[PDB]
Write a protein that binds this DNA or RNA. Structure first.
Lengths: 56, 345
DNA sequence: CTTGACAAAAGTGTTAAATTGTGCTATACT
């Protein structure tokens, strides 16, 4: 359960950060995430994909 | 329940076949070399940023917050390393994730082989550790065999791990079991000897002797070297061990206290401390106050002849004769009063 | 109450022998 967010220029988060709807993911401000959850940043698939989650 | 606990915790996570295994090891080594790669980025040691990965991985605030009152705090010696390499181009910022995923994969492969480590410590029981202990230290041996493993050699990690688990366990034995600290080699030789004994017992159809058992041990092995260390080997004895056959008696309650002087000694000693004071007053103001300085009676520390002669203005010779004569001159009073003639032990 | 002389006991220092603490072992072995 997650949503994919492809990128082009690097990323602003590591693997496991806590995001929120409307936060800056990668691409220096282009691609933003609309949902909560830890962000699992992948290199090969070039995706900042965020899994629905709540840091509890 | 702690017993079932770990078993049901590791039984939750599955094992790893060749695919996952080889992959995981490759991930780990890639993260390692990625660290070495970034070790030249800002000039930080390969071990430094390595643990800096832990700060956001296997706990946020819990890894460096309490390794004692002092360690490498999050704000001070950590944060300036977390937000330092944080601004570097692609060709650098990628190795960050390589290290993230490598570092995670490490722990992963460990968890995968945990279902082995436990099944390993199963043979090593009886060491003064009921399972869970043995398993814990074994897990440490796994952690070792992990960072030292090489997938490239096409070896099954189950082989490499075992040799290290058996190590971290057989090591933990000597550093735990005997209440009295017994150094590694000591226990090593112990097991060697006891092995020979427990072996030739059935061979000869009876127990050996310090001469014949040490004989098959090697050079310099006499009755002594075996019987001597045999004592050392023996652990202490629980003071709760019941004495006799009746349920009352305790072991510890059967031990005296000679640590503190008995009342009879309080008076025995306080008596001499006085009786020697009254039988002393028959000495000249010199040969008395000086006769105390040589016995450590004055300042409690003994004052050698050299210093005494400096205190009275006399010479290293005069005080010498002073003591002699002053002393026997008291011997006359003793042999005539019989007041102190006791205390001859 | 004393001076020089001087054995024995005691001291300062380096080295040898002994003791002690660690790291590894790869067929595979869950």
């Amino acid at each position: 359960k997650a949503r994919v967010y492809p990128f082009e220029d690097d990323v602003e988060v590591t693997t496991g950060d806590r995001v929120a709807p409307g936060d800056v993911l990668a691409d220096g401000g282009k691609v933003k995430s609309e949902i909560y959850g830890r962000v699992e940043v992948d290199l090969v698939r070039n995706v900042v994909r965020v899994v629905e989650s709540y840091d509890i | 329940d702690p017993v079932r606990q770990y078993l049901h915790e590791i039984g939750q996570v599955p094992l790893l076949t060749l695919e996952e295994e080889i992959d995981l090891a490759r991930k780990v080594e890639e993260g390692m070399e990625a660290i070495k790669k970034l070790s030249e980025a800002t000039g930080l040691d390969q071990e430094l940023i390595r643990e800096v990965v832990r700060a956001k991985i296997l706990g946020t605030a819990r890894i460096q917050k309490i390794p004692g009152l002092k360690e490498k705090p999050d704000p001070k010696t950590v944060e300036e390393v977390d937000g330092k390499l944080k601004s570097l181009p692609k060709e650098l910022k990628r190795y960050l994730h390589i290290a993230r995923e490598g570092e995670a994969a490490r722990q992963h492969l460990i968890e995968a082989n945990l279902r082995l480590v436990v099944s390993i410590a199963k043979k090593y029981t009886g060491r003064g550790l009921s399972f869970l202990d043995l398993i814990q230290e074994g897990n440490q041996g796994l952690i070792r065999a992990v960072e030292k493993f090489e997938y490239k050699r096409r070896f099954k990690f189950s082989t490499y791990a075992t040799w290290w688990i058996r190590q971290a366990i057989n090591r933990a034995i000597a550093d735990q079991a005997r209440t009295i600290r017994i150094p590694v080699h000591m226990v090593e030789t112990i097991n060697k000897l006891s092995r020979t004994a427990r072996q030739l017992q059935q061979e000869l159809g009876r127990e050996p002797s310090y001469e014949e058992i040490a004989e098959a041990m090697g050079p310099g092995w006499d009755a002594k070297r075996v019987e001597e260390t045999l004592k050392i080997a023996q652990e202490p004895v629980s003071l709760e061990t019941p004495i006799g056959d009746e349920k009352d008696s305790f072991y510890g309650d059967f031990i005296p206290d000679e640590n503190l002087p008995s009342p009879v000694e309080a008076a025995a000693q306080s008596l001499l401390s006085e009786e020697l004071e009254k039988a002393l007053s028959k000495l000249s103001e010199r040969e008395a106050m000086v006769l105390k300085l040589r016995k450590g009676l004055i300042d409690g520390r003994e004052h050698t002849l050299e210093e005494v002669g400096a205190y009275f203005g006399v010479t290293r010779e005069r005080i010498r004769q002073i003591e002699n004569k002053a002393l026997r001159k008291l011997k006359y009073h003793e042999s005539r009063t019989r007041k102190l003639r006791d205390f001859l032990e």
